[PDB]
């Protein structure tokens, strides 16, 4: 699920919005941990 909020360059507005569904991945793999990827 994802949302892009163009919305206050750094501060949070304490607003509210919903995430629309974006992609369904039929992988079937056991997932217990994850890590981010940086350039």
């Amino acid at each position: 699920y994802s949302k892009h909020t163009p919305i206050i360059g750094r501060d949070f507005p304490q607003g509210f919005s919903a995430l629309e569904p974006l992609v369904d991945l039929p992988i079937g793999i056991n997932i217990t941990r994850f890590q981010t990827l940086l350039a």
């Binding site: 039929p26 079937g28 793999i29 056991n30």
Partner: protein, 49 residues
């Protein structure tokens, strides 16, 4: 013998999961690694005839 089936696993699968792994399964109480007295290959084939 091209088709392989899993007979030994630590726990049950969840719906629509796959387990494409050859890691040796320990069936007995004595710790072991590789094939051995209490260690078996987790997959077996059916020699369909």
């Amino acid at each position: 013998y091209d088709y392989w089936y899993r007979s030994l696993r630590k726990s049950k699968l969840k719906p629509f999961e796959r387990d494409i792994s050859t890691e040796i399964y320990q069936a007995g109480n004595k710790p072991c690694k590789g094939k051995g007295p209490n260690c078996y290959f987790p997959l077996e084939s059916y020699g369909f005839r």
